[PDB]
Amino acid sequence: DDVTGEKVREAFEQFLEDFSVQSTDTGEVEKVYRAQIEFMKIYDLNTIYIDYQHLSMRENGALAMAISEQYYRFLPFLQKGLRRVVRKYAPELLNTSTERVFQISFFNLPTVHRIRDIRSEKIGSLLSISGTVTRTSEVRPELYKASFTCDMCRAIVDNVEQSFKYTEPTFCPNPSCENRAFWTLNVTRSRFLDWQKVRIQENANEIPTGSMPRTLDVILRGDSVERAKPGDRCKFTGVEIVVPDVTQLGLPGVKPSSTLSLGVRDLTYKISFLACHVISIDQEVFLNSLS
Amino acid sequence: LTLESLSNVKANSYSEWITQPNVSRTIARELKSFLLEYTDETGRSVYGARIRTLGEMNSESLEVNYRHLAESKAILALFLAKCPEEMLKIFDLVAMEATELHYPDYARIH
Amino acid sequence: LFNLELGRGVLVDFGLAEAQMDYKSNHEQFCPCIMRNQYSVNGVDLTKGYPKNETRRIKRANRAGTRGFRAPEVLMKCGAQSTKIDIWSVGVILLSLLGRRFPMFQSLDDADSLLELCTIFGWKELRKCAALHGLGFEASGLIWDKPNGYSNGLKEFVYDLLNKECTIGTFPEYSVAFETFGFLQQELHDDAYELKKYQEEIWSDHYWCFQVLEQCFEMDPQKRSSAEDLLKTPFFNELNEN
Amino acid sequence: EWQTNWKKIMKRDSRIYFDITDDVEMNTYNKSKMDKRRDLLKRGFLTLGAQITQFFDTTVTIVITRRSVENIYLLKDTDILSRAKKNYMKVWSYEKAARFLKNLDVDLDHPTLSNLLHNEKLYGPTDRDPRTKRDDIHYFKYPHVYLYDLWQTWAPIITLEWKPQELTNLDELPYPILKIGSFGRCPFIGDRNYDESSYKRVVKRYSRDKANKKYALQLRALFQYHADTLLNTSKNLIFIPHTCNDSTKSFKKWMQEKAKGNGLGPTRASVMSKNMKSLSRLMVDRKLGVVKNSGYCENCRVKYESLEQHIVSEKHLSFAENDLNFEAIDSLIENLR
Numbered sequence: 001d002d003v004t005g006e007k008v009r010e011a012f013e014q015f016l017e018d019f020s021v022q023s024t025d026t027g028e029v030e031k032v033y034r035a036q037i038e039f040m041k042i043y044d045l046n047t048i049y050i051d052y053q054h055l056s057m058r059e060n061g062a063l064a065m066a067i068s069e070q071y072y073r074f075l076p077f078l079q080k081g082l083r084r085v086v087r088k089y090a091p092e093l094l095n096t097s098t099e100r101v102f103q104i105s106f107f108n109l110p111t112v113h114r115i116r117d118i119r120s121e122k123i124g125s126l127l128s129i130s131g132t133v134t135r136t137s138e139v140r141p142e143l144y145k146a147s148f149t150c151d152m153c154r155a156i157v158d159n160v161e162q163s164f165k166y167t168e169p170t171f172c173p174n175p176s177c178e179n180r181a182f183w184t185l186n187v188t189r190s191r192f193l194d195w196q197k198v199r200i201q202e203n204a205n206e207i208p209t210g211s212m213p214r215t216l217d218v219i220l221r222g223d224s225v226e227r228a229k230p231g232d233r234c235k236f237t238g239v240e241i242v243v244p245d246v247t248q249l250g251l252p253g254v255k256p257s258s259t260l261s262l263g264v265r266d267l268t269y270k271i272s273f274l275a276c277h278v279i280s281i282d283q284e285v286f287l288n289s290l291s
Numbered sequence: 292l293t294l295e296s297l298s299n300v301k302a303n304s305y306s307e308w309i310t311q312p313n314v315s316r317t318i319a320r321e322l323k324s325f326l327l328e329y330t331d332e333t334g335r336s337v338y339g340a341r342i343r344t345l346g347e348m349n350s351e352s353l354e355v356n357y358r359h360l361a362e363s364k365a366i367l368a369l370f371l372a373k374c375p376e377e378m379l380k381i382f383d384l385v386a387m388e389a390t391e392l393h394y395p396d397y398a399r400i401h
Numbered sequence: 402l403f404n405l406e407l408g409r410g411v412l413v414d415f416g417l418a419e420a421q422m423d424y425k426s427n428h429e430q431f432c433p434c435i436m437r438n439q440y441s442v443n444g445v446d447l448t449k450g451y452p453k454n455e456t457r458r459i460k461r462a463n464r465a466g467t468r469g470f471r472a473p474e475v476l477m478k479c480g481a482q483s484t485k486i487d488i489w490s491v492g493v494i495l496l497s498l499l500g501r502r503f504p505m506f507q508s509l510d511d512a513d514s515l516l517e518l519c520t521i522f523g524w525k526e527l528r529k530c531a532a533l534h535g536l537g538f539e540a541s542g543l544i545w546d547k548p549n550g551y552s553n554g555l556k557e558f559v560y561d562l563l564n565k566e567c568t569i570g571t572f573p574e575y576s577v578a579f580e581t582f583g584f585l586q587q588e589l590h591d592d593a594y595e596l597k598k599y600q601e602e603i604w605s606d607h608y609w610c611f612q613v614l615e616q617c618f619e620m621d622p623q624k625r626s627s628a629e630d631l632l633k634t635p636f637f638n639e640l641n642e643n
Numbered sequence: 644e645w646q647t648n649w650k651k652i653m654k655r656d657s658r659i660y661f662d663i664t665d666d667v668e669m670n671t672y673n674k675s676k677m678d679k680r681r682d683l684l685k686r687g688f689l690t691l692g693a694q695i696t697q698f699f700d701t702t703v704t705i706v707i708t709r710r711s712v713e714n715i716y717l718l719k720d721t722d723i724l725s726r727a728k729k730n731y732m733k734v735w736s737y738e739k740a741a742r743f744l745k746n747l748d749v750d751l752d753h754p755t756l757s758n759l760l761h762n763e764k765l766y767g768p769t770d771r772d773p774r775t776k777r778d779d780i781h782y783f784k785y786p787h788v789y790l791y792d793l794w795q796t797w798a799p800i801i802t803l804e805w806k807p808q809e810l811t812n813l814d815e816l817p818y819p820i821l822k823i824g825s826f827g828r829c830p831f832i833g834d835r836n837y838d839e840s841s842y843k844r845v846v847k848r849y850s851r852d853k854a855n856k857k858y859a860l861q862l863r864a865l866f867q868y869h870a871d872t873l874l875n876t877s878k879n880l881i882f883i884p885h886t887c888n889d890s891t892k893s894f895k896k897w898m899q900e901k902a903k904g905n906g907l908g909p910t911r912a913s914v915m916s917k918n919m920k921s922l923s924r925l926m927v928d929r930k931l932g933v934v935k936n937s938g939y940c941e942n943c944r945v946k947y948e949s950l951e952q953h954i955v956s957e958k959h960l961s962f963a964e965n966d967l968n969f970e971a972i973d974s975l976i977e978n979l980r
């Protein structure tokens with residue numbers, strides 16, 4: 001294992017408990033993260049909103065910089081730390097009632113990147129984008145964790161994690177088997193989340209001289225599905241992501257390729273986005289959202 | 292585990308009881324104890340004498356006596372008598388471990 | 402420039418001469434090379450490796466000198482070069498006389514000088530000096546005729562230098578090196594009255610020369626005695642006539 | 644004063660053993676904790692200087708077991724701890740081992756997250772195989788010389804390694820050997836294309852020597868045991884005999900046998916780009932296709948193949964014509980007068 005990952009995970013779960021923002025005159029000081037955890041237990045939701053400003057304030061923002069620069073690498077550590085914190089205080093909401101997935105969303109990033117500002121050096125990092133929603137697809141299931149039926153000693157392995165791509169369980173329900181050639185998936189022991197792809201488009205005011213509009217594909221995973229109608233300006237916060245592309249086969253420039261036998265595979269990709277959450281920009285509900 | 296842990300037997304097959312993972316580890320540790328601890332009357336090591344023999348004439352065999360092991364641990368002797376198919380394999384490994392403890396790097400010789 | 406008829410000499414070139422700047426505004430922290438700029442992760446050790454892609458800087462220390470006549474201080478780019486590099490060079494010149502070898506240290510680079518010093522003194526001693534100056538050093542696989550040899554002292558070195566000349570017969574009959582050869586023969590255990598007086602005096606002179614050579618030839622700068630300390634030697638009794 | 648009592652002869656005591664087995668209810672994680680505390684306890688006496696043995700013998704006093712430290716309180720037949728009373732051979736518990744170590748008090752071992760991150764800027768991430776292989780560093784295989792900064796803050800000064808095959812000839816080792824040679828040559832060079840016994844060379848050297856006999860005699864006469872020249876002013880010579888062969892005796896033997904550039908260079912950077920490393924592999928000889936005054940002109944910061952053309956170069960001529968570069972020199976020039 002990695003020592004640095006353990007360090008960042010333990011610090012994460014440490015300040016999920018030790019952090020406490022003041023309430024100024026009215027309310028003294030309260031544990032904002034613990035207050036949000038109590039809110040989570042009360043409403044039985046599935047996603048926790050964490051302000052980036054507080055993380056920047058804490059510990060001279062070194063941990064904030066570390067989590068912003070390498071969000072993808074530390075994400076499983078973040079999930080584990082949050083699970084342990086939930087176990088410490090109010091562990092009732094841990095399970096679905098098999099297991100309930102906890103989503104972590106960061107909001108109020110210091111800066112906003114336009115679609116034309118996407119850069120390769122920001123790949124895998126945390127940032128925010130602002131675009132206009134053009135096409136929205138159906139909310140479809142995706143394999144959070146995948147179960148399969150064995151080939152030799154036909155039997156079903158239960159609740160195995162499914163990565164970004166198809167995975168094969170190395171272990172077997174029968175330990176003597178150690179055969180994985182033919183797996184038959186079963187939906188019962190396979191977890192799922194909500195998947196929806198939204199094609200955002202650059203806003204008019206951000207377009208340079210002469211350039212025709214540029215657009216990006218944004219994937220909304222979790223409760224944020226169907227949160228934006230087509231033709232609305234929304235602010236997306238998430239992690240910069242890459243997805244394989246097979247169309248750029250004749251483009252100029254040497255195509256990266258992997259050799260392994262032969263083991264050939266063209267490493268061509270296109271940039272996309274995975275957004276943690278989306279923010280847009282009777283008389284009772286209307287009357288409520290006023291000062 | 293303990294000496295009486297082996298005495299308390301619970302399994303459908305005797306060889307399965309011997310090869311029970313925790314019980315197998317217990318057997319390995321107990322055999323280690325028997326070989327490292329048993330000593331002759333005059334304070335001279337029995338297994339120490341045997342490993343001194345093996346170190347200089349470099350044989351692939353050790354002449355381990357059954358009687359001394361029997362008065363050492365009766366349960367292991369009875370396991371050997373009833374199911375020698377498995378304990379001897381473990382005893383070979385623990386003998387190699389002890390030889391390495393005394394004479395490390397014995398792979399090239401044997 | 403030394404004149405024999407006058408019997409006196411003077412220094413002339415000061416071309417690379419450097420004025421000793423302010424060193425600072427125990428001896429282990431005297432020169433571990435942490436001075437001036439850069440003054441005051443575990444688990445990875447580059448003990449037996451050179452990085453494939455090198456992304457680090459070299460020492461930036463003065464290397465002015467000559468082919469040979471260069472001190473271990475400057476040779477290993479050891480920081481805060483002291484005045485005593487000069488007395489080291491003086492000792493090198495002295496040893497050049499004792500052995501009749503003018504190109505005493507043919508060093509085509511720093512590596513040649515370092516390996517020659519390793520030959521003369523020993524791998525362990527040079528490693529000890531480098532460690533004193535906060536510097537790691539390692540060498541293995543190389544073959545030396547004297548493996549950590551000549552620990553007896555420089556006497557054995559000049560001894561076999563003169564030994565091979567003796568066997569060949571390079572020197573003339575009147576060469577004054579033969580008295581030194583006899584001195585080392587006697588000390589290594591390996592009318593007549595004026596003769597015995599003369600040989601006694603040369604015993605004493607060679608003795609003191611060889612114990613001032615080792616006095617100057619020591620890697621430790623702080624331990625290396627200053628020029629006044631060199632002049633205070635029992636060998637230098639001719640200044641006492643003042 | 645018990646430490647002095649216990650620092651007296653255990654540096655000379657050569658028998659050390661530690662008991663492994665015990666009769667307790669221990670879990671797998673508890674087994675791992677037992678293993679780590681066991682290895683720490685072993686290391687506690689590992690450096691003490693008393694040799695350790697792997698067998699229980701009536702000679703080895705040091706034996707420690709967790710339970711039944713004379714605590715059975717009953718007779719036993721196949722227990723080393725049953726014999727511990729009769730053999731008097733000392734036994735403690737691991738907790739009692741720590742109790743006695745309190746007398747010794749041996750240290751358990753002989754964070755900066757931002758620092759950790761900007762150190763992982765170097766070495767890459769630290770999550771690698773804890774082995775002798777990383778492929779990020781050329782590990783030494785052949786005979787080599789390596790000198791490195793202790794703190795690794797600066798690049799290694801000298802780092803040279805040689806394949807065994809190129810070391811075949813002893814005459815041209817890349818590291819010179821003490822091949823003394825003769826005739827007062829460099830100790831690290833010899834008589835290449837030269838033979839001290841070559842009779843023509845012997846004759847030439849003998850003629851040169853007999854030419855310089857009087858001068859050497861004058862030197863010895865000038866300098867003989869008075870430590871001074873003018874003090875020497877007021878016996879002609881002193882010859883200490885030797886069995887050594889010289890030019891004259893060897894010559895007599897042979898006759899009997901036959902009786903029947905600039906010094907300055909531009910400062911260069913340390914780090915070489917990876918593209919430079921790639922280019923340096925493809926290097927071949929220049930013969931495929933297409934005086935000594937060559938040096939570096941630090942005044943013009945330029946390297947010249949010929950000096951006579953650099954002095955007449957436009958930049959150098961302009962530099963010479965500018966007196967602003969020599970003002971400090973003139974300041975001390977005028978102070979002379």
Ligand SMILES: [Mg+2]
Nearest residue numbers: 413414415416
């Ligand atoms: Mg000069």
Ligand SMILES: [Mg+2]
Nearest residue numbers: 414415416417
């Ligand atoms: Mg000069």
Ligand SMILES: [Zn+2]
Nearest residue numbers: 150153172177
């Ligand atoms: Zn199977």
Ligand SMILES: [Zn+2]
Nearest residue numbers: 432434479534
């Ligand atoms: Zn230094």
Ligand SMILES: [Zn+2]
Nearest residue numbers: 940942943959
């Ligand atoms: Zn010029």
